[PDB]
Amino acid sequence: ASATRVIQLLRNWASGRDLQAKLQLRYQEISKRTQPPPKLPVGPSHKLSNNYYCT
Amino acid sequence: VGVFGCPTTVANVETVAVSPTICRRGGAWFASFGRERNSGTKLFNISGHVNHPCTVEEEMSVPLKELIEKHAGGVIGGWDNLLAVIPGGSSTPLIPKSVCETVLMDFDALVQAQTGLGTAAVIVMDRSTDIVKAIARLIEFYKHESCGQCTPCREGVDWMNKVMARFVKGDARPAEIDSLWEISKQIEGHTICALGDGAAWPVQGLIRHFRPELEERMQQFALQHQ
Numbered sequence: 199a200s201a202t203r204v205i206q207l208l209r210n211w212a213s214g215r216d217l218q219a220k221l222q223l224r225y226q227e228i229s230k231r232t233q234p235p236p237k238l239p240v241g242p243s244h245k246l247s248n249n250y251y252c253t
Numbered sequence: 254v255g256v257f258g259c260p261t262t263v264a265n266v267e268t269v270a271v272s273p274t275i276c277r278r279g280g281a282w283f284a285s286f287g288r289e290r291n292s293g294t295k296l297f298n299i300s301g302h303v304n305h306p307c308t309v310e311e312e313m314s315v316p317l318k319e320l321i322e323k324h325a326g327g328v329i330g331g332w333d334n335l336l337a338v339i340p341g342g343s344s345t346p347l348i349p350k351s352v353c354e355t356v357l358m359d360f361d362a363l364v365q366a367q368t369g370l371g372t373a374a375v376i377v378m379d380r381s382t383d384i385v386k387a388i389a390r391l392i393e394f395y396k397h398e399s400c401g402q403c404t405p406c407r408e409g410v411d412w413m414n415k416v417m418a419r420f421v422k423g424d425a426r427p428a429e430i431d432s433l434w435e436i437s438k439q440i441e442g443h444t445i446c447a448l449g450d451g452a453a454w455p456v457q458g459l460i461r462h463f464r465p466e467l468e469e470r471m472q473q474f475a476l477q478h479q
């Protein structure tokens with residue numbers, strides 16, 4: 199990330215591609231492991247009227 | 254069959270005790286009074302929010318206004334206070350002030366009025382009387398009076414009692430009135446006897462006649478019991 203500038207320009211040149219733009223491993227780009235409580239939606243039949251299962 | 258498996262003519266006392274006059278005078282006497290089919294004379298039991306609640310023999314196909322004016326001095330607070338009337342009886346749905354005026358209590362005219370002749374046990378609720386509360390005792394009266402043999406009535410009125418208890422209090426959502434509509438028709442025509450259907454008509458009539466008032470009371474509950 200860690201890796202200094204001297205190692206960086208070696209790996210950019212040897213690959214020929216800017217690897218520091220995106221890494222193959224994540225330092226801090228992830229969702230926080232615990233999440234705030236969710237609220238699940240409802241569907242087309244969570245009604246009390248004209249939802250007779252026969253039709 | 255019947256009592257002890259015997260032929261048994263069940264006739265209402267009013268029909269029994271009027272049968273004399275139709276045998277002493279003839280069918281011309283009976284049929285002359287009253288409309289087509291609906292003819293003769295019946296005990297119109299005027300009560301509720303009426304100045305002089307009483308039981309009077311009365312002609313049918315009679316306008317509601319002079320029914321309470323001539324025989325009782327009027328309805329408490331006049332017609333404007335009169336919010337609705339149950340003209341026929343419990344099994345006869347209540348109808349709004351915009352409809353009462355001079356509807357005729359002949360069976361055909363109650364049918365077009367989405368009600369029935371019942372027993373002409375006409376009672377009135379004023380504006381001060383909450384219609385949701387007015388039948389609140391009526392619907393629970395039906396629950397207190399049910400043999401409970403058939404499933405639609407045994408599970409119906411009590412379930413109707415609880416869902417309307419949160420209705421008159423207002424602890425419901427606008428859809429709940431539609432569900433009350435659905436199960437009311439569900440028990441209609443599905444009970445062994447006419448108690449369920451007799452209990453269906455009052456609540457059924459209220460829904461399609463004072464629905465905005467039913468939707469009025471619930472957010473009144475929501476604003477203060479938030």
Ligand code: SF4
Binds near residue numbers: 402403404405446
């Ligand atoms: S509708 Fe009549 S028969 Fe059916 S449970 Fe009620 S009282 Fe009994």
